Every structure is written in C-alpha cells, then in structure tokens.
C-alpha cells in the first residue's frame, strides 16, 4: 500500500501528456517511472488516502489473479484473456513545451480493454485462492482496474531545464530521464466493487467504495490543506511531552532513510487497522503515543503520522535541509521561507481543495511545509 518517491521530470512529462490528450478529463498521469510497468491494462491499482488527497499505488496483481474463469469471448484459454481482450486503439503525438528536450514531439500508443469484456464483469465470483496482496487490502481503500493506457513506442530520453522557484529562494541545471519502450505514461481506471467477500462488479461512473458491505452513504472529508495541517498540529499538542519526544525522535530517524520510513508507515497502519499494540515492536514508543491515557487508540494521531510519512515521499532532494534545520534549530526560518515562496508564486495553495491536481513544484512545496510544520511543533 506504500507509495513511491518523487520523480519530478517524469511527472512533468506524463502530466504534459495528460494535458494534451485529456485536459480536465479522467486520464491520470503516471507519477513514477518505477510504476510504469505495473499500471498496464488488466492491472489492479490501490487508492489510499493521503494529505494531498488520494494516491494510486501498484499492487502487482491483475484481474486474472482474483477472477474465476458475437463477442469473441468464448474459449481463448481464459488465462491469456489479458492479451486477447486488450486492443490497440491508435497512435498519438504529444507536442512538448520549450522546457522539455528529446534526444519537439513524442509518439505514444494507446491500448484499451474491449467494451465487450468489460461488460462481462458483472456479478463475477472471485477465486477460491486469493493472493495475500488482495485479501489484506485495507477495507477502507479503493481498488481500480486499468482500462486504458498510453505508452511510449520506443526508448526515449528527455530533459527538463525548468527551474523550481524554491531552489534559489531557500546547483543543478537539467533533469534527465530515459524511458524504456512500451512504458505506460498515462492511464484510465474503472472502479472494482465487492458487495461481499465472494463477488465482484465493475463500476463505470460515480464515486463509490470498493468494499461497501455494512457501510452507509456518507459525506466524505472536504477540508482544505490549512485546516488539515492545523488539526494535525492540535492533535500533537494533546500529547505528553514524553510522547512528543517519542514521536519527534521516531520521525527524525526517518529523514533520508526510506526503509525506516516505509517500516514505520506499515507499522502505524497495522496498529491503526488492528487497534492493538503487541510486545514485539522496537518502535513501541511511537506506537504507544497513538493511544490515549485510557489505552485506547486515537486514530487522529495515527492518521497524522501516516500523512507526515507519506508527505516525506514528495521530498526526494529536501530531507537533508529539513534534518539540518531540525538539528541546528532553524526550522522557523525554513518554514517562513517556504511560506514566502508559496505566497509569491501560487494563490492560496495552502488552502487548496482536497484532491487537487498538483504540479510537481507545488506538491513539493506543500509537502515541505507540512513536514517542517510538524517537526517544528513537536520541538
């Protein structure tokens, strides 16, 4: 359920692809090259809730890993349904802006799952042996099926000379990425719903929950980023200075350390889903701070820490600065600088509506702001 570090130049390219082909539509840009192989048609994608809204993450699963098996659908082995029911639906040209160089246009190829096949995904029964990646999904997250992809047709190398304003207002010229052939750049999804533990339907239009059994129609979160960050700060002020020290140290050990961050995220998610703390956690202090004086888990603390840990992923080149400012006690100056850049180049970006499409620079500034604010309040 974890995400992937920030790959800024690649996200720039894929977002340009999405703007020129489905501006304002439902096509989604692949953020990380690392995921451009597990976002193909028939692949299953998870949707988790973060500070900025929703994050799509790879599962490695496909529809065939969970589904029991004049349209041309009878026969076909039922094991290679992936290649047979994915049709090439044309080729397209994306004109690149001035900041992007190619080793002025990139060619891409579109693949789609046939509407016929997608029409058979009603009242389908899941397999009797479901992979652990599927049955251990947090029953509050969503699950999607990749329906359409746009991919490169050959190996490309691209450069961005675009400069981020916060680089000079807080020594690298161009950012380069080499994309292998047939790598997905943008995709479209359709939601998978599971009315019970043995059934699966496809959902085409409208927001919904993939696991609706026992749940009711409920108005979802609509807070902006400022409200969310302030509620986080209040959550940490309801903490014993000892619990505050525990959390601050556990978080400080994560800067520049991807494995510590991933393990802490997974463990906080574990204790959020279970509500229990066992006697086999070295990071038991942090996991202890998630419980109130009555030994009951405060989900707000777990969600705040998970949002901090997820925001750390958008800071691929900035965690060293934050750690230095935490050690030298200069986080106030850093927070002021970040707020200044946000107020100079963007408008009310700190009050952005939930699940806003963020340009990479904007998302990096917001993640930096959240991380610095949390570390400052905890100290």
């Amino acid at each position: 359920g974890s995400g992937r570090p920030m790959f800024s130049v690649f996200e720039e390219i894929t977002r340009i692809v999405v703007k020129e082909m489905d501006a304002g539509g439902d096509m989604i840009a692949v953020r990380s090259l690392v995921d451009a192989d597990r976002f193909r048609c028939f692949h299953l994608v998870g949707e988790k809730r973060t500070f900025f809204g929703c994050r799509h993450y790879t599962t490695g699963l496909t529809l065939m890993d969970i589904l029991d098996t004049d349209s041309g659908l009878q026969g076909q082995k039922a094991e290679f349904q992936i290649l047979d029911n994915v049709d090439s639906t044309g080729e397209l040209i994306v004109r690149l802006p001035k900041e992007i160089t190619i080793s002025q246009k990139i060619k891409i190829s579109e693949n789609r799952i046939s509407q016929q096949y997608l029409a058979t995904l009603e009242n389908r029964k899941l397999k009797r042996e479901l992979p652990f990646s599927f049955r251990s999904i947090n029953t509050r997250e969503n699950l999607y099926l990749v329906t359409e992809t746009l991919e490169t047709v050959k190996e490309e190398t691209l450069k961005s000379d675009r400069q981020y304003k916060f680089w000079s207002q807080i020594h690298k010229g161009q950012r380069e990425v080499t994309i292998p052939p047939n790598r997905v750049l943008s995709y479209r999804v359709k939601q998978l719903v599971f009315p019970n533990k043995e059934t699966m339907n496809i959902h085409f239009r409208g927001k919904t929950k993939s696991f609706p059994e026992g749940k009711s129609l409920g108005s979802e979160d609509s807070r902006n980023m400022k409200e969310k960050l302030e509620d986080m700060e209040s959550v940490l002020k309801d903490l014993t200075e000892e619990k505050r020290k525990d959390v601050l140290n556990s978080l400080a050990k994560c800067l520049g350390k991807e494995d510590i961050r991933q393990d802490l995220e997974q463990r906080v998610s574990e204790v959020l889903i279970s509500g229990e703390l066992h006697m086999e956690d070295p990071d038991k202090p942090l996991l202890s701070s998630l419980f109130n004086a009555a030994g009951v888990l405060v989900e707000a603390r777990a969600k705040a820490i998970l949002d901090f840990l997820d925001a750390l992923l958008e800071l691929s080149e900035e965690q060293q600065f934050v750690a230095e400012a935490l050690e030298k006690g200069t986080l106030p100056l850093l927070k002021d600088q970040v707020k200044s850049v946000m107020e100079q180049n963007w408008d009310e970006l700190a009050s952005s509506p939930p699940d806003m499409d963020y340009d990479p620079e904007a998302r990096i500034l917001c993640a930096l702001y959240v991380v610095v604010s949390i570390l400052l309040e905890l100290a």
Binding site: E20, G25, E91
Partner: protein
C-alpha cells in the same frame, strides 16, 4: 521499369539510403508484393510506384511531394515527412496517415475512408468527411471550423486548433461509444442539440473561452439528478 529506378538511384544524396530503396522497389515489383515500406531511409524523392501495392509506408523520411498513388492503395502512411501536399486519393483507400508533415489543405477524401490521421500540420480547412469515417485526428492544426460529422465517427481528436464554432453532429444516429476532443480551442458557445445527446458521447471542451451563460447552463444541466447526457469535461 528497372531503368527508371536505376536512374532515380543516381542521385545518392547524403544520408539517403537509396540502395535499400532500390532493392525494396525491385523486390516489390518483381514479386507483386502488397506492401512497400521505405521508412527511415531519409529519402527526398520517390519514383513511379508499383501500381499493384495495397499499402505504401514511407514514414520518417524527407519527402516533399508524393508520386501518383496506385489505383488500389488501401493504406498510405507518410508520417513525419515534409509533404506540403498529397496527390489524388484512390477510392480504394481506407487509411490515410500523414501526421507530422507540412500540410495546409487536403484533397477530396474517398467516401469509404475509415481512418484519417493528419495531426501535427497547418491545416486551415477540412474537406467533406467520408461517410464511413470512424477515426479522425486533426489535433495540432489551424482549423477554424469542422465539416459536419459523419454518422459512424467514433474517435475525433480536434484539440489544439483555432476552432470558433462547435461542429454539427449526426443527430445521435450513432449509438456506439464515441469520444470527441475539442480542448484548447476558441469555442464560446454550444448548440441546444447538446442537451439531447446520449451518454454514449464523451466530449472534452476544456480550455475553451466558454461564455458565462453557456457555463451556467452546463452547470445547471449536469447538476440535475436527471442528467443522462454526454460525459462532458469543461475546465479552464
């Protein structure tokens, strides 16, 4: 015929792989091969073409004009060339791909043409669209209007043009799934007929100077619990 190709070979420009081209042309004529592919040869000209060919693929070259097309061509792929004009199209043509070239106009389009890809050009006008047309790419051009759309048209990519008026549709005479892209244009109004289109339409008119009245009517129409119209996207 062999002497014509041999004399055409005598140019031998820098980067022109004209020997490979002579081999492929002679093989195509002598064996009566349905497909002739001269792609990625940096060629600047083409001789008389084997008049039996079904598909001519001359993508990624330096062509500025094209010879007379064989009378039974089904597919013509001339992407990424410098073609400022393309010759008369045979009625047997069903796929025309000449994207990424230097075209400002197109000839009369055979009525049984199924695929037309002319994106990345400088087109100012489009001819009457063939009735059997199913897939059309005209994005990255300078079109100000579009001909009335045929009935069997499934994919229309007309974004990034200079469109001023919304095109005339086929009165929902088609009932399959269709995606029409009009984003990044100059359309300021929409016809009332829009409110009678089915859910089978996916229309993208984002990045358009839509008037306040059109935007408010779109918001009132899509916000109604009783909206079963097109999947519409409108965002500036």
């Amino acid at each position: 015929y062999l002497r014509i190709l041999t004399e055409w070979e005598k140019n031998s420009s820098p980067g022109e792989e004209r020997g490979i081209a002579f081999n492929r042309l002679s093989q195509c004529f002598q064996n009566q091969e349905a497909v002739l592919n001269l792609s990625d040869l940096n060629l600047t000209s083409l001789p008389e073409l084997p008049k039996h060919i079904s598909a001519l693929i001359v993508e990624n070259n330096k062509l500025t004009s094209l010879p007379k097309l064989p009378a039974f061509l089904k597919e013509l792929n001339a992407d990424n060339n410098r073609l400022s004009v393309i010759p008369e199209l045979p009625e047997s043509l069903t796929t025309l791909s000449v994207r990424s070239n230097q075209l400002e106009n197109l000839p009369v389009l055979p009525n049984h043409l199924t695929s037309l890809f002319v994106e990345n050009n400088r087109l100012y006008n489009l001819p009457a669209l063939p009735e059997k047309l199913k897939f059309l790419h005209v994005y990255y051009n300078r079109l100000t209007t579009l001909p009335d759309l045929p009935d069997k048209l499934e994919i229309l990519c007309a974004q990034r043009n200079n469109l001023v008026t919304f095109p005339q549709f086929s009165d929902r005479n088609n009932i399959r799934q269709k995606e029409y892209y009009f984003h990044f244009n100059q359309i300021t109004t929409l016809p009332e007929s829009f409110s009678q289109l089915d859910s089978s339409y996916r229309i993208n008119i984002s990045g358009n100077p839509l008037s306040t009245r059109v935007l408010q009517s779109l918001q009132r129409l899509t916000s109604s619990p009783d909206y079963h119209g097109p999947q519409i996207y409108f965002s500036m």
